[PDB]
């Protein structure tokens, strides 16, 4: 899978539907900022500092 707006790689169709909401597309909330570079494969998300058990998120 992949989003043709920001060129990010997803895995599930529900994942794509939840991802396009950050750009403004609908379908049929934990992140604060979401970046992605164009020369490498390494997204960087940023989540609030009080939440528990963060899985590799700044």
């Amino acid at each position: 899978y992949q989003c043709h707006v920001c060129s990010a790689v997803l895995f599930s169709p529900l994942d794509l539907d939840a991802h396009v909401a950050s750009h403004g597309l609908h379908g049929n909330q934990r992140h604060i900022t979401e970046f992605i570079s164009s020369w490498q494969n390494h997204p960087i998300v940023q989540v609030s500092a009080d939440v528990e058990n963060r899985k590799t998120a700044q």
Binding site: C6, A21, S22, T33, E34, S38
Partner: protein, 49 residues
């Protein structure tokens, strides 16, 4: 029952948004309900030659 507080109902020739707020507060008004979306800060960092 105080009809002064139920103004838009009792008073026929009153605009639906009229309020005499400083003197008597009304108990039946016109509320405006919203439904927004607050997306996260998105960016696509491109490189420069």
């Amino acid at each position: 029952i105080p009809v002064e507080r139920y103004n838009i109902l009792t008073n026929p020739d009153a605009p639906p948004t009229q309020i005499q707020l400083p003197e008597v507060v009304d108990l039946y008004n016109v509320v405006t309900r919203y439904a927004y979306e607050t997306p996260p800060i998105t960016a696509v960092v491109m490189g420069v030659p």
